[PDB]
């Protein structure tokens, strides 16, 4: 008798840059450079 | 592009355009990194908001273990899940039966 | 001196000045990644325009 | 993380230092240091205090 918490995730994501790391795996990523 | 401009003003134009290209490329990189960090922090903040909101709803009746699962002392059924889901649950109704555990 | 974030073990038997590993390792990893991102030379060679 | 590890065995006084009710030895120091501590061995002794 318990309830747990969580969030959606994907098997394969996209590596994006960030302010403190390189190639962080996230769920989705759009393209800002045409 | 077809007929070449004077060489000095062409070099000035290329140097200015290269400096503007450097400024816009650095601005784009800083922008992408900053808003990716803010999106990750926003997702973490929303998860923390949901976790603490469920903790405040469950009160002393459910003690957190350090996993995200809540050990509710009362026999909290499916309607009890609905009550803690859509902001309906009251701890004062169930504290008497969940206090001794 | 071992790590950034440490512990003060007060067991009424001694003073254990230990150091954690996971959180300080994540902090050093993020900070050195930040310096690897930012502290870099330019990739564009410029030219001398004036004299 | 330390607060989640110490369920009822220790509480925050207000200055940010936990007050463990039960007897928590140097092995218990190590257990909460490398995150192997369990509440299943000292729920009752800390609850009675
Ligand atoms: C991810 O973003 C793209 C836009 O690039 C969108 O088409 C797609 O529906 C989004 N979701 C998934 C699961 O791919
Ligand atoms: C300016 O740069 C372009 C390439 O972007 C080049 O074709 C052109 O020759 C340059 N201008 C001069 C005066 O060299």
TrEMBL record, chain A:
It comes from Influenza A virus. In natural infection, inactive HA is matured into HA1 and HA2 outside the cell by one or more trypsin-like, arginine-specific endoprotease secreted by the bronchial epithelial cells. One identified protease that may be involved in this process is secreted in lungs by club cells. Binds to sialic acid-containing receptors on the cell surface, bringing about the attachment of the virus particle to the cell. This attachment induces virion internalization of about two third of the virus particles through clathrin-dependent endocytosis and about one third through a clathrin- and caveolin-independent pathway. Plays a major role in the determination of host range restriction and virulence. Class I viral fusion protein. Homotrimer of disulfide-linked HA1-HA2. Belongs to the influenza viruses hemagglutinin family. Glycans are attached at residue 28. This is Hemagglutinin. It is found in: Host apical cell membrane; Virion membrane. The chain holds residues 19 to 52 of 560 of the full protein.
